Write an enzyme that holds these catalytic residues in place. Structure first.
Site, PDB file in Angstrom:
ATOM      1  CG  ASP A  34      -1.654   1.151   0.972  1.00 34.83           C
ATOM      2  OD1 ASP A  34      -1.908   1.712   0.306  1.00 34.83           O
ATOM      3  OD2 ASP A  34      -2.031   1.094   1.989  1.00 34.83           O
ATOM      4  CG  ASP A 220      -3.434   4.022  -2.328  1.00 32.98           C
ATOM      5  OD1 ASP A 220      -3.383   3.138  -1.978  1.00 32.98           O
ATOM      6  OD2 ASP A 220      -4.644   3.863  -2.477  1.00 32.98           O
TER       7      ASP A 220
END
Length: 370
Positions: A34, A220
């Site tokens: 992440d 992201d």
């Protein structure tokens, strides 16, 4: 780097995870990659959704930091006990480091029932780590304790199972085509960048570039869809509807709710526009652009698809939709992020995704939100 190729796995919509080992002896766990967060946190108690979990008491190298951590969410959260231990990535650089680890003991709406990962590896900066910016992120520790260059790159390949590559400390030329273009990391908290222009099928969306980065834009790997701010979203949809007006779709579709299907092998790709995002360049008044084909924002679920472009209220998010079409280089050492056409993107027999430049764009700074 060929040892690291294909070291990412996952299930559609459940994110990409890499294998890691923690403690002594080594405990194997699948960890979500992440770039939108900064904590290394793993399940450390028998939550029913977990295939396995980190068991501290079994590690001779475990050190309790006698400190707790609590990470909230829109309506969920994870909490745990802080510590440090020896961490390793079997299909990554051949090293081991002592890093901060948040042993998750309680959580809500965090783990996914049916997923194959047991933790998360936040690769963003300390600035947004919890409980505060003093908890050193894993990558910072990796770089400061070894000779691994301060950069990593991601090739998310989508498809059901998905796969990808996280090249740690380097760049693998075989994962992309054409050239790599760089956009500056506006600020070191999220992986923030600046979009200075947006086009649909080659036509400018005619908007103040500031609306594109309101109230920020980030890269992201933790997000599935390309998320655009309201104003931008409605403008984009209105434009995509028009391009594909040759056919009608229920309001539920343009909301990622109801899907659309076509006879197996007869999806009308040609009626869907290509989207172009212009990013600030490395040189004054210079920019470059990245373009995604519809095969990017129309993700499968006879052929059925779901609109993979949703609206946001927290800025532009360039998730898997965007990333899966490109090889993204997170050049931390030089405060920049590079893009190049991915060697594993899906393409049309007529149209092709791309990363091109240079372009002349004035007052790009003005596009940034403050």
């Amino acid at each position: 780097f060929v040892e690291m190729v294909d070291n990412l796995r996952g299930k559609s919509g459940q994110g990409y995870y890499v294998e890691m080992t923690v403690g002594s002896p080594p405990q194997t766990l699948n960890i979500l990659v992440d770039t939108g967060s900064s904590n290394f946190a793993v399940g450390a108690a028998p939550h029913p959704f977990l295939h396995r979990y980190y068991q501290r008491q079994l590690s001779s190298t475990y050190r309790d930091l006698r400190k707790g951590v609590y990470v909230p969410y829109t309506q969920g959260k994870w909490e745990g006990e802080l510590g440090t231990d020896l961490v390793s990535i079997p299909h990554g650089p051949n090293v081991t480091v002592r890093a901060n680890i948040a042993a998750i003991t309680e959580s809500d709406k965090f783990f996914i029932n049916g997923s194959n990962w047991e933790g998360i590896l936040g690769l963003a900066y300390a600035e947004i780590a919890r409980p505060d910016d003093s908890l050193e992120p894993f990558f910072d520790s990796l770089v400061k304790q070894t000779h691994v260059p301060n950069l990593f790159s991601l090739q998310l390949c989508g498809a059901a199972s998905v796969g990808g590559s996280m090249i740690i400390g380097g760049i693998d030329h075989s994962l992309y085509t054409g050239s790599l273009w760089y956009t500056p990391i506006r600020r070191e908290w999220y992986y923030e960048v600046i979009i200075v222009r947006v086009e649909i099928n080659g036509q400018d969306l005619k908007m103040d570039c500031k609306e594109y980065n309101y109230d920020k834009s980030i890269v992201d790997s933790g997000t599935t869809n390309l998320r655009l701010p309201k104003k931008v979203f409605e403008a984009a949809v209105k434009s995509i509807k028009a391009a594909s007006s040759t056919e009608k779709f229920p309001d539920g579709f343009w909301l990622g709710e109801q899907l659309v299907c076509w006879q197996a092998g007869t999806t009308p790709w040609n009626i869907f526009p290509v989207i172009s995002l212009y990013l600030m360049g490395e040189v004054t008044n210079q920019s470059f652009r990245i373009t995604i084909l519809p095969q990017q924002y129309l993700r499968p679920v006879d052929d059925c698809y779901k609109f993979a472009i949703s609206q946001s209220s927290t800025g532009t998010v360039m998730g898997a939709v965007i990333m899966e079409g490109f090889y993204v280089v997170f050049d931390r050492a030089r405060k920049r992020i590079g893009f190049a056409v991915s060697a594993c993107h899906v393409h049309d027999e007529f149209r092709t995704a791309a990363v091109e430049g240079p372009f002349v764009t004035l007052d790009m700074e003005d596009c940034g939100y403050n």
